[PDB]
Amino acid sequence: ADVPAGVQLADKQTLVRNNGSEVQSLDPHKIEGVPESNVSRDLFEGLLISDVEGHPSPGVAEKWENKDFKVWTFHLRENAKWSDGTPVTAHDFVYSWQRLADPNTASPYASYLQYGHIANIDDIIAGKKPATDLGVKALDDHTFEVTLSEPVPYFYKLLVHPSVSPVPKSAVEKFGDKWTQPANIVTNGAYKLKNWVVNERIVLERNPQYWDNAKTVINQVTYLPISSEVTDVNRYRSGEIDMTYNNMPIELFQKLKKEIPNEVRVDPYLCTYYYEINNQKAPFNDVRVRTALKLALDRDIIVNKVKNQGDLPAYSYTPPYTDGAKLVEPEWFKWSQQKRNEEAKKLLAEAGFTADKPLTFDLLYNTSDLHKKLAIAVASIWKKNLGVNVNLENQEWKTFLDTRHQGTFDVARAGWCADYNEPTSFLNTMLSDSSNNTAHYKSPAFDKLIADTLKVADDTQRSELYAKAEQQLDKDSAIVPVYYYVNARLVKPWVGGYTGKDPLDNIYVKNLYIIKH
Ligand SMILES: [U]
Ligand SMILES: [U]
Ligand SMILES: [U]
Ligand SMILES: [U]
Ligand SMILES: [U]
Ligand SMILES: [U]
Ligand SMILES: [U]
Ligand SMILES: [U]
């Protein structure tokens, strides 16, 4: 943290943050969500980290170079250590990226190495080559060299993500899935794991072996797993919680802006809220049905009437304010809702649905006040505008993500947040073979548009391709875009260091501090 001249620090430097749900795991290779990554950034540190405004900056690597954007050389700081006092070396990164690529790990983020095009990743994922063939090597203890199969000018931006953080081989090997328990885990971030009580709290304490430990201020941070945004706000206003999770309740939000204006932080956020359709299961494999659902949803009602928290109605997957996004707003989004409804009803009628044989299906969402209230409104809108019947189903976060990968569901509430600020961070998740493709969408045309983005060496050509890729997704009605999120959360006046300037919201508790109050 960088404490400004003149601020008076509290004697006790502890923090309590809500984290939305119970984490899936603390193993960097088994996690895929925001809650998981929030904790991961305090415990595991990769080559680069985000600074407090979100710019990619030195992590374990103090400096790096590239040759033609294909061979990246990372110079690791000599004093980087794990929490047991042992050095963090390039060998740690070799083992860790191999483990991420290895099909035996079954990482949900194995395709992150495809997004960066590390050499030989496709064959490794397919089991055609051993994970030891991956295009990574340690040139010495403090030098990690990555070789890509084609130039990737933004490669370094990918490196702040948890999937490419190092894991401690000896602990993984000796304890298996219990390596993350407090007695066994070893971490290299600013914090260490103190306590993990499932569905109650995760408590982290300062890691004195962290290389930048002298700048760390907060001595202990607790992460809570509260999925009710109303409860989160209640425990924040009672004094227990210092920073809520950034999902706000429909119940109280209006009231909050009027009651505590300076505590309500509202900043840009590269995430898109949408209803994910299982594209591989009839009747959702019919483009007419998917289009009907996309068009009959009334975004103005949801975004401005039922939710109304600063979100913008969406017409795409990639947020239009992503760096590199120059999207074409489709004609259907400019129409009146009445015109969208008529076309939707027409399409469903063409698909064979009638009053006596209506379309009835499930809408899966993870436990949440926000998601439940929005799914109820969406069910009423689709019923009224299109005559379709929806059965709502809630699941807790970890189960919910597994269900979507299992891919026999109908429609699920979904939200993707960028891992790096570039359109492929969204677009690559819709590739036919992506490990993040929970839409189960497979379009050879779409895949080809993305493949061509690194075969041109011009930003305009790349941007026009990303725009065409969004058009391909939209033409196929792969998803039902609802709104682009804003990063809205409550932060006590005494919490310093949270700028809200990072559109990825990559917070590190090592950057925060408690002002005397
Ligand atoms: U004190
Ligand atoms: U650049
Ligand atoms: U940029
Ligand atoms: U269903
Ligand atoms: U509620
Ligand atoms: U460039
Ligand atoms: U106080
Ligand atoms: U106090």
- List beta partners, residue 491: 243
Q: Which ligand lies nearest to the CA atom of residue 324 in the structure?
A: 3
Distance in angstroms (rounded) separating the CA atoms of residues 270 and 165 = 22
Phi, psi of 316 (to 5 degrees): -140, 180
Distance in angstroms (rounded) separating the CA atoms of residues 365 and 378 = 12
Query: Which DSSP string corresponds to 301-312?
Result: IIIIIII-SS-E
Distance in angstroms (rounded) separating the CA atoms of residues 400 and 442 = 22
Is the distance from CB of 229 to CB of 369 less than 8 angstroms?
A: yes
Distance in angstroms (rounded) separating the CA atoms of residues 244 and 507 = 13
Going from the Cα of 165 to the center of ligand 2, the distance in angstroms, rounded, reads 24
Distance in angstroms (rounded) separating the CA atoms of residues 251 and 231 = 11
Q: Which ligand lies nearest to the CA atom of residue 239 in the structure?
A: 7
Locate 124 and state its tokens: 């490794």
Q: Which ligand lies nearest to the CA atom of residue 373 in the structure?
A: 5
Residue 61 Rama label (left phi>0; alpha psi -120 to 50; beta)? beta
Going from the Cα of 212 to the center of ligand 8, the distance in angstroms, rounded, reads 28
Going from the Cα of 271 to the center of ligand 5, the distance in angstroms, rounded, reads 24
Locate 292 and state its tokens: 């009907």
Element containing residue 125 per DSSP (H, E): helix 121-125
Distance in angstroms (rounded) separating the CA atoms of residues 207 and 495 = 21
Going from the Cα of 150 to the center of ligand 3, the distance in angstroms, rounded, reads 20
Distance in angstroms (rounded) separating the CA atoms of residues 3 and 9 = 9
- List beta partners, residue 265: 489
User: Is CATH 3.90.76.10 correct for 45-168?
Assistant: yes
Distance in angstroms (rounded) separating the CA atoms of residues 487 and 268 = 6
∠ CA 256-483-31, nearest 5°, is 90
Contacts of 29 (CB under 8 A, 6+ apart): 96, 99, 100, 105, 107, 109, 163, 167
User: Is CATH 3.10.105.10 correct for 271-486?
Assistant: yes
First vs last C-alpha separation in the chain:
19
List the one residue out of 127, 98, 34, 110 whose CA is nearest residue 433. Answer: 110
Q: Which ligand lies nearest to the CA atom of residue 11 in the structure?
A: 1
Distance in angstroms (rounded) separating the CA atoms of residues 107 and 101 = 8
Distance in angstroms (rounded) separating the CA atoms of residues 412 and 98 = 32
Instruction: Tally the residues of the chain.
Output: 517
Going from the Cα of 510 to the center of ligand 8, the distance in angstroms, rounded, reads 22
Q: Which ligand lies nearest to the CA atom of residue 364 in the structure?
A: 4
Amino acid letter, residue 492: K
Distance in angstroms (rounded) separating the CA atoms of residues 47 and 92 = 11
Locate 449 and state its tokens: 């548009």
Residue 377: alpha-carbon gap to chain centroid: 25
Going from the Cα of 459 to the center of ligand 2, the distance in angstroms, rounded, reads 9
Contacts of 517 (CB under 8 A, 6+ apart): 10, 492, 493, 494
Going from the Cα of 2 to the center of ligand 1, the distance in angstroms, rounded, reads 22
Sign of CA dihedral 249, 250, 256, 257: positive
Distance in angstroms (rounded) separating the CA atoms of residues 173 and 232 = 38
Is the distance from CB of 313 to CB of 330 less than 8 angstroms?
A: no
Going from the Cα of 12 to the center of ligand 1, the distance in angstroms, rounded, reads 7
Cis amide leading into 153 (omega within 30): no
Contacts of 417 (CB under 8 A, 6+ apart): 34, 269, 270, 271, 485, 504, 505
Alpha-carbon Rg for the chain, nearest whole angstrom, is: 23
Going from the Cα of 421 to the center of ligand 6, the distance in angstroms, rounded, reads 14
* Cβ atoms < 10 Å from Cβ of 451: 12
Is the distance from CB of 375 to CB of 365 less than 8 angstroms?
A: yes
Phi, psi of 488 (to 5 degrees): -105, 120
Confirm whether 45-168 and 271-486 share one CATH topology. no
Residue 454: alpha-carbon gap to chain centroid: 23
Distance in angstroms (rounded) separating the CA atoms of residues 89 and 472 = 43
Contacts of 398 (CB under 8 A, 6+ apart): 21, 22, 23, 24
Going from the Cα of 55 to the center of ligand 3, the distance in angstroms, rounded, reads 10
List the one residue out of 428, 403, 426 whose CA is nearest residue 413. Answer: 403
* Cβ atoms < 10 Å from Cβ of 24: 18
Burial of 306 (0-12, 13-18, 19+ CB in 10 A): middle
Phi, psi of 239 (to 5 degrees): 105, -10
Three-state DSSP state, 503: coil
DSSP state of 327: P
Locate 195 and state its tokens: 């306590």
Burial of 11 (0-12, 13-18, 19+ CB in 10 A): exposed
How far is residue 19 from each of residues 365, 368, 383, 477, measured CA to CA in Å?
17, 12, 34, 32
Q: Which ligand lies nearest to the CA atom of residue 278 in the structure?
A: 4
Upper half-sphere CA count for residue 469 (Cβ side, 13 Å): 28
| Residue that is written with structure tokens 């079954």 in the block | 106
Going from the Cα of 226 to the center of ligand 4, the distance in angstroms, rounded, reads 28
Three-state DSSP state, 115: helix
List the one residue out of 160, 162, 164, 180 whose CA is nearest residue 40. Answer: 162
Locate 256 and state its tokens: 């909050």
Going from the Cα of 11 to the center of ligand 1, the distance in angstroms, rounded, reads 5
Phi, psi of 191 (to 5 degrees): -125, 165
Query: Which DSSP string corresponds to 204-221?
Result: EEE-TTSTTGGG---SEE
Q: Which ligand lies nearest to the CA atom of residue 459 in the structure?
A: 6
CATH classification for the domain delimited by 1-44+169-270+487-517, as one of 3.40.190.10, 3.30.43.10, 3.30.470.10, 3.50.30.60: 3.40.190.10
| Residue that is written with structure tokens 């540190």 in the block | 45
Going from the Cα of 154 to the center of ligand 2, the distance in angstroms, rounded, reads 7
Distance in angstroms (rounded) separating the CA atoms of residues 407 and 274 = 17
Give the CA-trace dihedral at 119, 121, 124, 130, to 10 degrees: 30
Provide the residues around ligand 5 (an ion) whose CB is within 5 A.
369
Q: Which ligand lies nearest to the CA atom of residue 234 in the structure?
A: 5
Provide the residues around ligand 3 (an ion) whose CB is within 5 A.
323
* Paired sense of beta strands 136-140 and 143-147, if any: antiparallel
Q: What is the resolution of this structure in A?
A: 1.9
Going from the Cα of 472 to the center of ligand 6, the distance in angstroms, rounded, reads 25
Going from the Cα of 351 to the center of ligand 2, the distance in angstroms, rounded, reads 47
* Cβ atoms < 10 Å from Cβ of 406: 11
DSSP state of 262: G
Contacts of 217 (CB under 8 A, 6+ apart): 1, 3, 9, 13, 510, 512, 513, 514
Going from the Cα of 115 to the center of ligand 2, the distance in angstroms, rounded, reads 18
List the one residue out of 330, 329, 322, 332 whose CA is nearest residue 462. Answer: 322
Q: For the chain, give every domain's residue range.
A: 1-44+169-270+487-517, 45-168, 271-486
List the one residue out of 123, 118, 121, 124 whose CA is nearest residue 104. Answer: 124
Query: Which DSSP string corresponds to 382-398?
Result: HHHHH--EEEEEEE-HH
Going from the Cα of 97 to the center of ligand 5, the distance in angstroms, rounded, reads 43
How far is residue 407 from each of residues 34, 256, 397, 436, measured CA to CA in Å?
21, 39, 16, 12
Going from the Cα of 224 to the center of ligand 3, the distance in angstroms, rounded, reads 34
Distance in angstroms (rounded) separating the CA atoms of residues 293 and 377 = 14
Going from the Cα of 507 to the center of ligand 8, the distance in angstroms, rounded, reads 26
- List beta partners, residue 48: 58
Going from the Cα of 283 to the center of ligand 4, the distance in angstroms, rounded, reads 10
| Backbone gaps in the chain, preceding residues (C–N over 2.5 A) | none
Distance in angstroms (rounded) separating the CA atoms of residues 512 and 500 = 12
